[PDB]
Design a protein around this ligand. Structure first.
Ligand SMILES: Nc1ncnc2c1ncn2[C@@H]1O[C@H](CSCC[C@H](N)C(=O)O)[C@@H](O)[C@H]1O
Lengths: 205, 284
């Protein structure tokens, strides 16, 4: 176990086999939801081809989904070797613990929540079931931060294991986690085994 | 750290216990124009509602085509085994597997432009209900979550599904769309964005399988179609504006000719709308 580690990279092209195996994978990908967005997205085929399978032999996946990715995310979860076994929802509140009910915040109904699929792979050991509820209640914070409560839920589920987050930003770096994303501050690696494999694979850089 | 997840670990109060103003009345107590939109739409629904109609039927053996005319909205509440495994109580009716549910010929009674609301539970039904929607010819388009609080009985409850990782404290009602509907052009069929995709109530009494009545309010506010079917309803869910069909109904009054007459000339299958509602409802 180590302090926060991160790699500024394009996740489509990083050879993630150098990172070893993780008890938990978490990802918040910019899905192609078939609408104009003020940020760039990954195509369905780019998502399908992410080398998620090498990151894990036994453990859990947390995959945020929205729009048509409710279904595309399920496809990816099964393709990567997981069975969906839970679905967390994050209920978004305002500053006074109320849901914002007005506006036009979904296509048919308004939206008060975000969804995170939970998948399992293999036969994980040393995990604690049933410690947390599958509902998170938290305000929206800063620039689209998913709720930090999720890290505590995952730590109670799988204490002291190594974990990897995909599409993370500097605010997402955490002890026991390796964070991958293209807005991180360079490359900061501390695990000697990961450092050694990184030098072999990228002798230049 | 105002971490309600940690607070649940420490106290047994579910995070949803701390969401304020979730009741039908208190949500817009301070917002007269928001309250007025709901009040006028509910009056429009009540003024145009058919009297309750209901039919006892063993849906597993029933030719569903005997239900006419076609329906603008269908609410489907099949009795899932998980409702009883997770509570421990013995069911007093046949439980339906997802294979059983899939076999229903819902596409044979849905109107060409219409919506479905399918209670899917909290486990494998979130996946298999989506397959049912495909089979019946709908596209999944929203997910209404019923989130259960435990304000009156704080504590943990063991989820019995051996695959579960977290304590399951909600149920999902998947919404599907059939046909082509454009919310800017088809305002005589839908009023979009009047409700949110969350219902928050206290966990029901020990042996209570009912779903929250607010699901009817969301459906009625959203779709102006007057032909509304509730499959697997019960005596306790009978409601003006709805045809209720289910195995545990104790009596039947459904007459297909009389029911259809409420929607044919000089009547309409749509509620219409008032100028006051048109000026208040959310629009592009
Ligand atoms: N191909 C790619 N490779 C690496 N990062 C990418 C990427 N495409 C998008 N990203 C990054 O992924 C991040 C999505 S914002 C992610 C939100 C994060 N879970 C939170 O809690 O805030 C952005 O920084 C974006 O620039």
């Amino acid at each position: 176990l180590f302090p926060p580690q991160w790699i500024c990279c394009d996740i489509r092209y990083l050879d993630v086999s150098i990172l070893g195996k993780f008890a938990v994978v978490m990802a918040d990908p910019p899905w192609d939801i078939h609408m104009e967005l003020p940020y760039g997205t990954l195509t369905d085929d780019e998502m399908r081809r992410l080398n998620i399978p090498v990151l894990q032999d036994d453990g859990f996946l947390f995959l945020w989904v929205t729009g048509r990715a409710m279904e595309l995310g399920r496809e990816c979860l099964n393709l990567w070797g997981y069975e969906r076994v839970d679905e967390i929802i994050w209920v978004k509140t305002n500053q006074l613990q109320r849901i914002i009910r007005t506006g036009r915040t979904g296509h048919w109904l308004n939206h008060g929540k975000e969804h995170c699929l939970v998948g399992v792979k293999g036969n994980p050991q040393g995990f604690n079931q049933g410690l947390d509820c599958d509902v998170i209640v938290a305000e929206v914070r800063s620039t689209s931060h998913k709720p930090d409560e999720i890290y505590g839920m995952i730590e109670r589920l799988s204490p002291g294991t190594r974990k990897i987050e995909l599409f993370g930003r500097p605010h997402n770096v955490q002890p026991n986690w390796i964070t991958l994303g293209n807005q991180l501050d360079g490359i900061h690696l501390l695990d000697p085994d990961v450092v050694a494999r990184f030098k072999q694979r990228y002798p230049d850089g | 750290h105002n971490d309600y997840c940690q607070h649940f670990v420490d106290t047994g109060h579910r995070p949803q216990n701390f969401i304020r103003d979730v009741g039908l009345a208190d949500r817009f107590e301070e917002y007269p124009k928001l309250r007025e939109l709901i009040r006028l739409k509910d009056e429009l629904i009540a003024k145009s509602n058919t009297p309750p109609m209901y039919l006892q039927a063993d849906i597993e053996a029933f030719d569903i085509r005997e239900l006419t005319p076609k329906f603008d909205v269908i609410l489907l509440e099949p009795p899932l085994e998980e409702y009883y495994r997770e509570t421990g109580i013995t069911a007093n009716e046949k439980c339906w597997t997802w294979d059983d549910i899939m076999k229903l010929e819902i596409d044979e009674i849905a109107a060409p432009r219409s919506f479905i609301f399918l209670w899917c539970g909290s486990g494998e039904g979130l996946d298999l209900g989506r397959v049912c929607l495909r089979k019946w010819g709908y596209r999944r388009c929203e997910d209404i979550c019923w989130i259960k609080t435990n304000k009156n009985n704080p504590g943990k409850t063991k989820t019995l599904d051996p695959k579960a990782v977290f304590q399951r404290t909600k149920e999902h009602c998947l919404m599907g769309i059939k046909g082509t509907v454009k919310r800017s052009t088809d305002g005589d069929f839908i009023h979009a964005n009047v409700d949110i995709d969350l219902i928050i109530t206290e966990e029901p009494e020990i042996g209570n399988i009912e779903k929250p009545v607010e699901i009817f309010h969301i459906i009625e506010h959203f779709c102006l179609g007057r032909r509304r079917l509730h499959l697997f309803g019960r005596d306790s869910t009978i409601r003006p504006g709805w045809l209720t069909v289910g195995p545990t109904l104790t009596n039947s009054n459904y007459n297909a000719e009389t029911y259809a007459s409420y929607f044919s000339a000089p009547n309409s299958y749509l509620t219409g709308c008032t100028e006051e509602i048109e000026r208040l409802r959310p629009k592009s």
